[PDB]
């Protein structure tokens, strides 16, 4: 249906400060075409273990039962747009 942006972050993760603002850019670009699921790893440890989160930030892009891409590090809004387009075009 629509692309899920599963985003694991923490307040102690330095790169997540900019990652969070980059996610703001992404949402502005896509609107309701993208759904940001912003997850505080410290508040969701079991969910984190489920997706085998070992680094922050971790960004997982999903659409209709299939995972498009996963990044275990900072990714700019522009680069996120690129591989979304790369995987869906
Ligand atoms: Cl949890």
mmCIF file of C-alpha atoms and ligand atoms in Angstrom:
data_model
loop_
_atom_site.group_PDB
_atom_site.id
_atom_site.type_symbol
_atom_site.label_atom_id
_atom_site.label_comp_id
_atom_site.label_asym_id
_atom_site.label_seq_id
_atom_site.Cartn_x
_atom_site.Cartn_y
_atom_site.Cartn_z
ATOM 1 C CA UNK A 1 0.000 0.000 0.000
ATOM 2 C CA UNK A 2 2.313 2.744 1.294
ATOM 3 C CA UNK A 3 6.013 2.883 2.221
ATOM 4 C CA UNK A 4 6.765 2.462 5.925
ATOM 5 C CA UNK A 5 9.830 4.249 7.247
ATOM 6 C CA UNK A 6 10.710 2.335 10.397
ATOM 7 C CA UNK A 7 13.234 4.534 12.194
ATOM 8 C CA UNK A 8 15.079 3.371 15.310
ATOM 9 C CA UNK A 9 16.720 6.180 17.277
ATOM 10 C CA UNK A 10 17.973 7.034 20.749
ATOM 11 C CA UNK A 11 18.622 10.276 22.601
ATOM 12 C CA UNK A 12 22.207 9.202 23.258
ATOM 13 C CA UNK A 13 22.856 8.612 19.550
ATOM 14 C CA UNK A 14 24.673 11.662 18.191
ATOM 15 C CA UNK A 15 23.813 11.052 14.542
ATOM 16 C CA UNK A 16 20.101 10.757 15.349
ATOM 17 C CA UNK A 17 19.793 14.477 16.009
ATOM 18 C CA UNK A 18 20.437 15.209 12.347
ATOM 19 C CA UNK A 19 18.742 11.962 11.295
ATOM 20 C CA UNK A 20 15.545 13.199 12.944
ATOM 21 C CA UNK A 21 15.668 16.517 11.085
ATOM 22 C CA UNK A 22 16.412 14.665 7.843
ATOM 23 C CA UNK A 23 13.267 12.605 8.508
ATOM 24 C CA UNK A 24 11.352 15.906 8.672
ATOM 25 C CA UNK A 25 12.582 16.743 5.173
ATOM 26 C CA UNK A 26 11.554 13.296 3.920
ATOM 27 C CA UNK A 27 8.022 13.601 5.322
ATOM 28 C CA UNK A 28 7.597 17.032 3.732
ATOM 29 C CA UNK A 29 8.673 15.581 0.388
ATOM 30 C CA UNK A 30 6.409 12.520 0.380
ATOM 31 C CA UNK A 31 3.543 13.423 2.703
ATOM 32 C CA UNK A 32 1.026 10.590 2.969
ATOM 33 C CA UNK A 33 3.018 8.524 0.472
ATOM 34 C CA UNK A 34 5.398 7.709 3.321
ATOM 35 C CA UNK A 35 4.615 6.732 6.917
ATOM 36 C CA UNK A 36 7.341 7.506 9.450
ATOM 37 C CA UNK A 37 7.408 5.065 12.351
ATOM 38 C CA UNK A 38 9.809 6.732 14.777
ATOM 39 C CA UNK A 39 10.907 4.314 17.496
ATOM 40 C CA UNK A 40 12.897 5.186 20.612
ATOM 41 C CA UNK A 41 15.064 2.099 21.101
ATOM 42 C CA UNK A 42 15.242 2.758 24.859
ATOM 43 C CA UNK A 43 11.444 2.575 25.049
ATOM 44 C CA UNK A 44 11.103 -0.399 22.688
ATOM 45 C CA UNK A 45 13.844 -2.897 23.482
ATOM 46 C CA UNK A 46 11.857 -5.979 22.445
ATOM 47 C CA UNK A 47 10.913 -4.451 19.109
ATOM 48 C CA UNK A 48 14.598 -3.611 18.649
ATOM 49 C CA UNK A 49 15.726 -7.177 19.321
ATOM 50 C CA UNK A 50 13.068 -8.369 16.879
ATOM 51 C CA UNK A 51 14.613 -6.362 14.033
ATOM 52 C CA UNK A 52 18.127 -7.167 15.267
ATOM 53 C CA UNK A 53 19.048 -3.520 15.842
ATOM 54 C CA UNK A 54 22.781 -3.301 16.572
ATOM 55 C CA UNK A 55 23.502 0.284 15.537
ATOM 56 C CA UNK A 56 21.744 3.636 15.592
ATOM 57 C CA UNK A 57 20.232 5.112 13.663
ATOM 58 C CA UNK A 58 18.648 2.147 11.907
ATOM 59 C CA UNK A 59 16.303 2.879 9.040
ATOM 60 C CA UNK A 60 14.140 0.156 7.569
ATOM 61 C CA UNK A 61 12.011 0.821 4.499
ATOM 62 C CA UNK A 62 9.004 -1.449 3.969
ATOM 63 C CA UNK A 63 6.250 -1.710 1.373
ATOM 64 C CA UNK A 64 3.553 -4.387 1.193
ATOM 65 C CA UNK A 65 5.228 -7.264 3.021
ATOM 66 C CA UNK A 66 8.621 -6.672 1.410
ATOM 67 C CA UNK A 67 11.602 -4.766 2.786
ATOM 68 C CA UNK A 68 13.047 -2.324 0.256
ATOM 69 C CA UNK A 69 16.238 -1.327 2.068
ATOM 70 C CA UNK A 70 17.866 -1.183 5.479
ATOM 71 C CA UNK A 71 20.560 1.184 6.728
ATOM 72 C CA UNK A 72 22.318 0.825 10.087
ATOM 73 C CA UNK A 73 23.756 4.335 9.930
ATOM 74 C CA UNK A 74 22.849 7.933 9.159
ATOM 75 C CA UNK A 75 21.168 8.501 5.802
ATOM 76 C CA UNK A 76 20.230 11.926 4.489
ATOM 77 C CA UNK A 77 16.727 12.692 3.267
ATOM 78 C CA UNK A 78 18.093 13.044 -0.267
ATOM 79 C CA UNK A 79 19.786 9.641 -0.171
ATOM 80 C CA UNK A 80 16.617 8.114 1.310
ATOM 81 C CA UNK A 81 14.613 9.541 -1.585
ATOM 82 C CA UNK A 82 17.163 8.135 -4.033
ATOM 83 C CA UNK A 83 17.014 4.489 -2.945
ATOM 84 C CA UNK A 84 13.246 4.633 -2.445
ATOM 85 C CA UNK A 85 13.098 5.681 -6.102
ATOM 86 C CA UNK A 86 15.811 3.140 -6.944
ATOM 87 C CA UNK A 87 13.824 0.247 -5.461
ATOM 88 C CA UNK A 88 10.366 1.263 -6.704
ATOM 89 C CA UNK A 89 11.166 2.385 -10.261
HETATM 90 CL CL1 LIG B 1 9.229 -3.300 22.812
#
